[PDB]
Design goal:
Elements (H helix, E strand, L loop, with lengths): L1 H7 L5 E4 L11 E6 L7 E5 L4 E5 L4 E2 L3
Antiparallel strand pairs: 1-2, 1-5, 2-3, 3-4
Length: 64
């Protein structure tokens, strides 16, 4: 699933957290700010923590 999102994640679209993260909730949402091609943690601005954090593609979902 991480492959699928890595391909279709547009610079400025709406993302979703499908698993509980270090400062982010499962069910929390964000925006794609920028990613790394070879490095899987994409930085996305999460509304619950109010900041851009490192999350993995397989736990990154899009419902936007």
């Amino acid at each position: 699933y991480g492959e699928y999102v890595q391909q279709t994640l547009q610079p400025g679209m709406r993302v979703r957290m499908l698993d509980d993260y270090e400062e982010i909730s499962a069910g929390d949402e964000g925006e794609f700010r920028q990613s790394n091609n070879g490095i899987p943690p994409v930085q996305v601005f999460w509304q619950s923590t109010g900041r851009t954090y490192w999350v993995h593609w397989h736990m990154l979902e899009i419902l936007g």
